[PDB]
């Protein structure tokens, strides 16, 4: 497999097929699906990491969309990257403005 040749879990072969089928360009370089499958795999790992840690602090083992939202909105970069995105069943980060706090 091309994924094994690159040390990846993400499918290098599939990504290469989606790039030519998706109408992005006439030809697709040999290293482009490899670089891309790696960038996608990295970002997935980066998210899964912070999401697993959110479930670790809520006494759960399985990550639900709430854990994904908590991971995204608590990061600065993941929040900016997924700024105009809505995670279904994610809820909001708990924040109450200081002016609304009791006197």
């Amino acid at each position: 497999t091309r994924s094994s040749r690159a040390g990846l879990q993400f499918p290098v072969g599939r990504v290469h097929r989606l790039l030519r089928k998706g109408n992005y360009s006439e030809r697709v370089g040999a290293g482009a699906p490899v670089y891309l499958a790696a960038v996608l795999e990295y970002l997935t790992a980066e998210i899964l990491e912070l999401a697993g840690n959110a479930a670790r602090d809520n006494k759960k083992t399985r990550i639900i969309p709430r854990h994904l939202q908590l991971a995204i909105r608590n990061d600065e970069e993941l929040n900016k990257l997924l700024g105009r995105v809505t995670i279904a069943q994610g809820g909001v980060l708990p924040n109450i403005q200081a002016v609304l706090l009791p006197k």
Binding site: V85, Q89, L100
Partner: protein, 78 residues
């Protein structure tokens, strides 16, 4: 059916948004703003359904319409 989106249902959405005091005029203004949002999304979703030569508006049609509106939705097969 626009009144089915009740005054207590609107107050819960304000609480999640971190709102302490809610004016009485708000409940009607929110109903107006929700109607606009729904119109805009469903209009494009249906435009997708009609292009697909279908009678049933699929989850994908609602997803594509949301991406067009810049309110991209994660989790519905996108």
């Amino acid at each position: 059916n626009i009144q089915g989106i009740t005054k207590p249902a609107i107050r819960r959405l304000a609480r999640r948004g971190g709102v302490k005091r809610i004016s009485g005029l708000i409940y009607e203004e929110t109903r107006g703003v929700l109607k606009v949002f729904l119109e805009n999304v469903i209009r494009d979703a249906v435009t997708y359904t009609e292009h697909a030569k279908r009678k049933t508006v699929t989850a994908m049609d609602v997803v594509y319409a949301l991406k067009r509106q810049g309110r991209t939705l994660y989790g519905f097969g996108g």
